[PDB]
Amino acid sequence: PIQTVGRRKEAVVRVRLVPGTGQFNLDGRTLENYFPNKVHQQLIKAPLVTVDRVDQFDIYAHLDGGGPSGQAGALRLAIARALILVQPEDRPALKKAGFLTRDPRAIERKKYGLKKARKAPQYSKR
Amino acid sequence: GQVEKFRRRYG
Amino acid sequence: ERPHAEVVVKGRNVEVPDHFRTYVSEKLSRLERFDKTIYLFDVELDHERNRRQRKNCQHVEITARGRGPVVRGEACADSFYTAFESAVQKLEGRLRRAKDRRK
Amino acid sequence: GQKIRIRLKAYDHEAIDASARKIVETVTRTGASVVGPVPLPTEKNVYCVIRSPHKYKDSREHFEMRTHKRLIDILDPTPKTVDALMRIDLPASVDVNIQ
Amino acid sequence: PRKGPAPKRPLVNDPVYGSQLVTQLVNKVLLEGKKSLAERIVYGALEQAREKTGTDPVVTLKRALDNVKPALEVRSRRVGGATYQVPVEVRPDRSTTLALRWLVNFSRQRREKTMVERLANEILDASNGLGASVKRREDTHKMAEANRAFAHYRW
Amino acid sequence: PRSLKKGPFVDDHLLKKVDVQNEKNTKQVIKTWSRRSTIIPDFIGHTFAVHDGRKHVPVFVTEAMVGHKLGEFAPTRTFKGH
Amino acid sequence: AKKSKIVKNEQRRELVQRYAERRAELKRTIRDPASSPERRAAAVSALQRLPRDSSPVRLRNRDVVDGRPRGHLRKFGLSRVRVREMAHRGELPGVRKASW
Amino acid sequence: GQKINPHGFRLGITTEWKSRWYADKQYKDYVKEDVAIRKLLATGLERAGIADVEIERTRDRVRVDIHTARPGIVIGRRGTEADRIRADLEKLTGKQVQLNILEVKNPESQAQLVAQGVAEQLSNRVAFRRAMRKAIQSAMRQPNVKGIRVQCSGRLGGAEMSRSEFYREGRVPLHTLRADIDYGLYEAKTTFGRIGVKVWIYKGDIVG
RNA sequence: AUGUGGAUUAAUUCGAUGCAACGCGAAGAACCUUACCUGGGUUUGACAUGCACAGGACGCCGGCAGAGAUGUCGGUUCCCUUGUGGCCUGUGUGCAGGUGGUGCAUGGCUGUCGUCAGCUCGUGUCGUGAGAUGUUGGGUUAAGUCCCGCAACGAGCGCAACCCUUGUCUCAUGUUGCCAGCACGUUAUGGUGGGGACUCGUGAGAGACUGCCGGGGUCAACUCGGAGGAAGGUGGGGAUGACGUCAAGUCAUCAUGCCCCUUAUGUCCAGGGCUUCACACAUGCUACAAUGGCCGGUACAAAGGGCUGCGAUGCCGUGAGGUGGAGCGAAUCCUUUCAAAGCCGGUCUCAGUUCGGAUCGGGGUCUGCAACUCGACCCCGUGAAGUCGGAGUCGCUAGUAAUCGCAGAUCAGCAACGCU
């Protein structure tokens, strides 16, 4: 079977990319009852746009961790990786698009001497 | 003023 | 802005006769005379009270606000009068220089 | 079957590893069933301070007293094997929960 | 950047329209992370314009942008006892950007009871050539005319 | 405040003093150090002296002063203006 | 800080072990329900007759040797300064400077 | 405050602890016990130099090892000193006292002991060049002694200014983690006031 | 709301003073704390430890006096083997104690210029000598990083790297966690047997090195474009603070050289204050509204903490909370199967309002011996100033800023909007 993974700032989701319809399952619901946000829909669908394979591969996945945006990014990453596993030849037009890079923009440690990461207090010269 | 009733509520 | 010079008289631990206050306010008016840009004058009158001292009994820190650049004059002497006058003359150098570079 | 669950605690992974190996060797002697060192997560107790006295709170220093942990589920409790396992002496950075 | 600049961010295309100035628009009207609120405001306003004009709002939007987008602006400098303003040409990137900034910040102080309406009416007004955005752009050109004298600086 | 179920704080020392005074059925000036005692209407004729960190102040009790602590009527801080 | 108040904190802990064990707690067990003699208990008054040092409220967790009475750490029974120094000398179980 | 303890900075990486156990609830107790132990050690013996104090705990027993280059001055030849200390251990509640004394090989390659010898020389009556320089040479003549530093402070010969000047030879890479280091400190008697001492010894590097 | 200055004040403990003091010492001032003030008692003392001498009890349990300190009666009137030991009763004796002063006598410890790239030595020559050269000149560098040169050859502390964390991947891996293929409960549900399959958690380890393609370059450094790769050119963030200055700060974290006290500057106590207020300053929070307020319905996170502690199931109370205790020394249970901003729906229609919440009068809850001075929370009523803010000024280059919420510790309970 097919089983692969994606991750974006504490947004893990496993993916079963079935060869069926474009019917999406997200823990017992669909891409419009979960994620009522067309931008997230676009991010999730753009690999299907890229290979022109909308309504060719069903999905079964589990929501875990992160929020909506991290979940969407990890999802499309995992879908891209599943497509590489189905066939490599689409790869050189994907890293071309960067639908494969695991977004290394994670949170910064809140530091001391501050109010948070970088916003210092109001520096008076008094 | 109603202290007879204050110390019926307070006992 | 003439009484707007925010006087701040103060001494951590000194016998402060209230005619020193007259001295301080007058010597600070003296520079109100030729700088009309003044908001704040935080001032101290400090005393190290060490035994067998190193020639420097009293101490003073002075800082002043101007429109942007702040001024800083520190001094040290045996008593109140040299302290006042010396910090005054250092401020005078600062402020002559500041109003020479202002234009 | 009958089960026995040993939960180990310590501060040094080197010691928890060495002791786990020695213990599982002793279990292996009498043919008693081993599950092995199933890794639990770690604890991270943290206690922030200030470095210096009387002021300078902006300067700080952090510390972290972790506690590594391991579960070793042992089965087939032959009481001879129990008599073997109960009485091993180990490094002192380890404490054990035989239950 | 004493050592050198760095790249610009790769704007996305719109899922609905096919234009990245619209994602630029939502990201310039955004306030306190409510990107989806910006999105729904903008889409509602543009569809209000659609029912106002019977056509796509994007064309009238870019026409308003053609009205309010300068290619010349000011850039000051302190010189010889009296600070001088100077005309400087403006590349199209910052032209569009500052135009949109004008557009939003002079939209906010209108009286349509609601941002979506204020914004939509401002866009229509600028397509027509009436908005305070256009007014300020004309003031900018007025200033450049008053200070053509300082172009030989070439800076 | 001192909730209902607990009952008030009427401390035992001056409780004993007032038991003495009302068993004798005569009322005299009394000196006490207890701001923290709340009031019963048993004290209305009684007279208390109470401390201000510095000295005492004899003060007479009244009906409507109940529900209060005596330190409400002992001034702690002198302030005279500037 | 002062040997006097260090001794006094110790002594208050001992008085606690005497009386707050049972004689300053069973009266709370009296005073919790609705079936109490609070109507006529005066267990409140007998508690007032017990000392003030009955309570742990009058305690103060001082550092076990130095007695810096503020900046206490209950994981160690020590103050921030000695804690620095001895963690810093490597004299504590599994204690080290950290990162994350 | 510039420079942290190299021991405390490399503690979990290169160097190691000096009081090993595990404990969840007896922790405060073990700490007050251990401070009382080290205090009574210093108070029970001072003619000799304790390099370290280290050993551990279990369900019942409370063991110690301890380092000093001159145990002959310390321990009861017949058992006097060790018995007084086992009694001190009974008093402060050890009750199973495996006081297993040990001694070092190279006392000159020990930071704490070199600093204690130096401070002894200072508190005797003595000046600074020959003591300092001769400790430096005594260390550097040995094989693993690949570097050294000394940072004395106090009022040498040369009335009242708190002067401090250092001496060194070899390598002292204190921002380098593969390095092994030994730190050495002292703070005790002298006529005018206190004298303080810090010492660094360098002993190869470590790859593991 | 906090912290200072200033004046009151009986006492408003003490220190902190530009950058580097002023949500500082405070990671918890109702008493305690607390060093301060009134009054009381006390004085080899609240505390140790050493002497000789008288002792066989010390104490401990209940009472009355008492603001308590403290004082007074009844009960226990020890075990060593007789030499006198544990103990204290006292006698004084060595004394013990000091938050009494000097951080400009000091150690330590720290902040700082500054995480800015420099600071120095040996031998060597030059110079009468102070001293210089080396470390200057050309290129390049995150940079005294490196190269081409020469009276300099080299070298050490430094910068960089070995550390952790995050970022991809392989091997092993199966509970307290995944649970696909399976089976069985089916309303609360991975709930239970069952599979290590994806996660996963913890451990070991390859992987990034201008390593490679090409163009420039003393052909040297070095840089400009490419491939792959997850990341590309000190991947990012931390930690790490050269010599040293600032007589920086700290004799109150501690320890300490000197001088002062000792019938009291010590010491045991109850009350009060450190929360005062005609004002000024500095740091922040919620507001000045429609990107909004109100009501209703629905979804996904990580992280930590928990025993004489955490606490729900059922119900009552408007709700603070209230008896009750399952279950947990804990990926199990409490931590809702861990939230809020957000999505959807309805009303409000630009206003001193369904803004805003202060201030104040009520009535109650909880922790504590104790809520007046001087605590938090809840309900009711109260409904103020305030309509985006002057000169000038602070912060921020990427998951950063801006915003919503949560958690922890110090904590009996709280000023926690603070801190991490």
User: Nearest 5°: CA angle at A115, between A114 and A120?
Assistant: 50
Is C33 within 8 Å of C49 (Cβ atoms)? no
CB-neighbour burial class of residue E22 (10 A; exposed 0-12, middle 13-18, buried 19+): buried
Q: Helix or strand or coil: residue A67?
A: coil
For chain F residues 14-53, those near strand I by a CB cutoff of 7 A are 16, 33-36, 38, 51-53
Q: Is the dihedral of CA A27, A30, A34, A38 positive or negative?
A: positive
CB-neighbour burial class of residue H34 (10 A; exposed 0-12, middle 13-18, buried 19+): buried
Residue A82, Cβ neighbours under 10 Å: how many? 20
Bin A33: left if φ > 0, else alpha if -120 < ψ < 50, else beta.
Answer: alpha
SS3 content of chain H, % helix, strand, coil (to 5): 30, 20, 50
17-36 in chain G: CB under 8 A from chain F: 31, 34
Nucleotide of closest approach to A3 (CA, C1'):
I198
DSSP state of D78: -
Query: What is the token pair recorded at D69?
Result: 């942990």
Residue H8 lies in a domain: no
Q: Helix or strand or coil: residue C41?
A: strand
Residue type, H18: K
Helix (H) or strand (E) segment spanning residue G34: none
Give the pairing type, strands C41-43 and A24-26: unpaired
Å from G5 (CA) to I62 (C1')? 30
Instruction: Name the residue among E94, E3, E100 with its Cα closest to residue E42.
Output: E100
Report the alpha-carbon distance of residue G26 to residue G41 in Å, rounded. Answer: 13
Å from H177 (CA) to I151 (C1')? 39
Q: How distant, in Å, are the alpha carbons of G85, H114, H130, H131, H150 from that of H134?
A: 30, 11, 6, 5, 12
Å from H20 (CA) to I87 (C1')? 38
Report the alpha-carbon distance of residue H151 to residue G41 in Å, rounded. Answer: 72
Q: How many helices (H) and strands (E) does chain F have?
A: 1, 3
Query: What is the token pair recorded at G69?
Result: 């009475």
Angstroms from H26 CA to nearest CA on chain G? 10
30-69 in chain E: CB under 8 A from chain A: 35-36, 39
Å from A27 (CA) to I190 (C1')? 14
Is D15 within 8 Å of D94 (Cβ atoms)? yes
Instruction: Name the residue among F66, F30, F24 with its Cα closest to residue F51.
Output: F30
Please tell me whether residues H132 and H61 are part of one structural domain. no
CA dihedral F9, F12, F14, F20 (to 10 degrees): 130
Residue A4: phi and psi, rounded to 5, are -155, 180
Nucleotide of closest approach to H205 (CA, C1'):
I162
Q: How distant, in Å, are the alpha carbons of C23, D96, E89, G27, G82 from that of A53?
A: 89, 57, 46, 78, 66
Q: Which residue's alpha carbon is at the shortest distance from the C1' of I270?
A: F33
Report the alpha-carbon distance of residue H105 to residue E132 in Å, rounded. Answer: 89
In angstroms, the first-to-last Cα distance of chain H is 31
End-of-domain residue from the set H105, H140, H167:
H105
Report the alpha-carbon distance of residue D12 to residue G95 in Å, rounded. Answer: 11
Q: Is some CB atom of chain D closer than 8 A to the CB atom of A112?
A: yes
Q: Which residues pair with H184 in a beta bridge?
A: H199
Report the alpha-carbon distance of residue C6 to residue G77 in Å, rounded. Answer: 49
26-55 in chain H: CB under 8 A from chain G: 27-28, 31-32, 34-35
Q: Is the dihedral of CA G48, G51, G54, G59 positive or negative?
A: positive
Å from C25 (CA) to I22 (C1')? 24
Residue H1 lies in a domain: no
Nearest CB among B3, B9, B11 relative to F41 is that of B3
Q: Helix or strand or coil: residue C77?
A: strand
End-of-domain residue from the set H75, H90, H105:
H105
Is D67 within 8 Å of D9 (Cβ atoms)? yes
Residue H166 lies in a domain: yes
Nucleotide of closest approach to G56 (CA, C1'):
I412
The answer to whether some atom of strand I lies closer than 7 Å to the beta carbon of C68 is yes
Residue G95, Cβ neighbours under 10 Å: how many? 24
Nearest CB among H1, H20, H24 relative to D93 is that of H20
Query: What is the token pair recorded at A2?
Result: 């097919």
Please tell me whether residues H38 and H110 are part of one structural domain. no
Residues G92, H5: C-beta atoms closer than 8 Å: no
Query: What is the token pair recorded at C90?
Result: 């250092």
Residue H51: phi and psi, rounded to 5, are -70, -55
Residue G35 lies in a domain: yes
Q: Is the dihedral of CA E25, E31, E37, E41 positive or negative?
A: negative
Please tell me whether residues H56 and H82 are part of one structural domain. yes
Give the pairing type, strands A59-61 and A24-26: parallel
- To one decimal place, what's the resolution in Å? 3.6
Residue H101, Cβ neighbours under 10 Å: how many? 15
Contacts of A90 (CB under 8 A, 6+ apart): A50, A51, A83, A84
Domain containing residue E89: CATH number: 1.10.455.10
Q: Is some CB atom of chain F closer than 8 A to the CB atom of G38?
A: yes
Domain containing residue D94: CATH number: 3.30.70.600
Domain containing residue H70: CATH number: 3.30.300.20
Q: Helix or strand or coil: residue H118?
A: helix
Domain boundaries, chain C: 1-103
Q: How many domains does chain D have?
A: 1
Contacts of H143 (CB under 8 A, 6+ apart): none
Instruction: Name the residue among F82, F62, F78, F7 with its Cα closest to residue F37.
Output: F7
C: neighbours with 3+ CB pairs under 8 Å?
A: A
For chain D residues 34-93, those near strand I by a CB cutoff of 7 A are 35-36, 38-48, 50-61, 68-69, 71, 73
Residues F11, G49: C-beta atoms closer than 8 Å: no
Angstroms from A10 CA to nearest CA on chain D? 17
Q: Annotate H2-18 with three-state secondary structure.
A: CCCCHHHHCCCCCCCCC
Q: How many domains does chain G have?
A: 1
Please tell me whether residues H174 and H134 are part of one structural domain. yes
Contacts of H38 (CB under 8 A, 6+ apart): H53
* Chain C CA closest to residue A126: C63
Query: What is the token pair recorded at D24?
Result: 């599982």
**Structural domain of E95:** 20-147
**Structural domain of G78:** 1-90
Question: If you write DSSP's letter for every residue of C3-39 in order, what string do you get?
Answer: TTSB-----SS----HHHHHHHHHHHHHHHTT-----
Domain containing residue G79: CATH number: 1.10.287.1480
Query: What is the token pair recorded at A45?
Result: 């669908």
Residue type, F4: L
* Chain H CA closest to residue D90: H58
C-alpha Rg value of chain E to the nearest Å: 18
Angstroms from F30 CA to nearest CA on chain B? 24
In angstroms, the first-to-last Cα distance of chain B is 16
Nucleotides on chain I within 7 angstroms of protein Cβ: 5-12, 15-29, 31-34, 37-38, 46-48, 61-63, 65-69, 97-99, 101-112, 114, 156-169, 173-176, 178-180, 197-204, 228-231, 235, 237-244, 247, 249-250, 252-257, 266-273, 276-278, 280-285, 290-292, 299-305, 308, 323, 329-331, 339-344, 349-350, 363-376, 391-403, 409-412, 419-420
Report the alpha-carbon distance of residue H85 to residue E105 in Å, rounded. Answer: 82
Q: Helix or strand or coil: residue D6?
A: strand
Strand ranges (DSSP E) for F14-78? 29-31, 47-51, 56-60
Residue G100 lies in a domain: no
Nearest CB among G65, G89, G93 relative to H23 is that of G93
Q: Which residues pair with D37 in a beta bridge?
A: D72
Report the alpha-carbon distance of residue D64 to residue D42 in Å, rounded. Answer: 12
Å from A63 (CA) to I189 (C1')? 18
Q: How distant, in Å, are the alpha carbons of B8, E83, H18, H22 from that of G77?
A: 49, 66, 19, 16
Is H16 within 8 Å of H54 (Cβ atoms)? no
Q: At what angle do helices E35-53 and E115-128 cross, to 10 degrees?
A: 50
Q: Is the dihedral of CA E105, E108, E109, E110 positive or negative?
A: positive
Residue H203 lies in a domain: yes
CA C43 to chain centre: 6
CATH 3.30.860.10 fits F1-82, yes or no: yes
Bin E54: left if φ > 0, else alpha if -120 < ψ < 50, else beta.
Answer: left
The structure's method of determination equals cryo-EM
Is C74 within 8 Å of C62 (Cβ atoms)? yes
What structural domains does chain A harbor? 1-126 (3.30.230.10)
Residues E15, A41: C-beta atoms closer than 8 Å: yes
Residue type, E118: R
For chain E residues 58-97, those near strand I by a CB cutoff of 7 A are none
The answer to whether some atom of strand I lies closer than 7 Å to the beta carbon of G86 is no
Q: How distant, in Å, are the alpha carbons of D61, H151, H177, H184, H197 from that of H170?
A: 31, 15, 17, 17, 19
Residue H9 lies in a domain: no
Residues A39, E39: C-beta atoms closer than 8 Å: yes
Q: How many domains does chain H have?
A: 2
Residue type, A71: Q
CB-neighbour burial class of residue H150 (10 A; exposed 0-12, middle 13-18, buried 19+): buried
Beta-carbon contacts below 8 Å between G and H? 51
Q: Helix or strand or coil: residue G11?
A: helix
Find tokens 């405390």 and name the residue. H8
Instruction: Name the residue among A97, A89, A76, A98 with its Cα closest to residue A13.
Output: A76
Q: How many CA atoms lie within 13 A of C63 on its CB side?
A: 5
Is G52 within 8 Å of G58 (Cβ atoms)? yes
Please tell me whether residues H206 and H117 are part of one structural domain. yes
Report the alpha-carbon distance of residue G10 to residue G62 in Å, rounded. Answer: 10
Å from E3 (CA) to I159 (C1')? 20
**Structural domain of H52:** 16-105
Chain D residues touching residue G97 (CB < 8 angstroms): 61-64
Q: Helix or strand or coil: residue G88?
A: helix
CB-neighbour burial class of residue A96 (10 A; exposed 0-12, middle 13-18, buried 19+): exposed
DSSP H helical segments within H50-166, as ranges?
80-91, 111-124, 129-140
Contacts of D78 (CB under 8 A, 6+ apart): D30, D31, D32
Is C88 within 8 Å of C96 (Cβ atoms)? no
The answer to whether some atom of strand I lies closer than 7 Å to the beta carbon of F73 is no
Instruction: Name the residue among E43, H171, C49, B7 with its Cα closest to residue F44.
Output: B7
Report the alpha-carbon distance of residue E88 to residue E155 in Å, rounded. Answer: 7
Chain F residues touching residue G38 (CB < 8 angstroms): 5-7
* Chain G residues with CB within 8 Å of chain D CB: 71, 73, 75-76, 80-81, 83-84, 87, 92-99
Report the alpha-carbon distance of residue D24 to residue D35 in Å, rounded. Answer: 9
Nucleotide of closest approach to F1 (CA, C1'):
I371
Residue E108: phi and psi, rounded to 5, are -60, -30
Report the alpha-carbon distance of residue C73 to residue C89 in Å, rounded. Answer: 9
Is H118 within 8 Å of H132 (Cβ atoms)? yes
Q: Which residues pair with H102 in a beta bridge?
A: H67
Q: How many CA atoms lie within 13 A of A6 on its CB side?
A: 30
Instruction: Name the residue among H1, H83, H17 with its Cα closest to residue H56.
Output: H17
Q: How distant, in Å, are the alpha carbons of E145, E151, E155 from that of E148?
A: 5, 6, 13
Q: Helix or strand or coil: residue A30?
A: coil
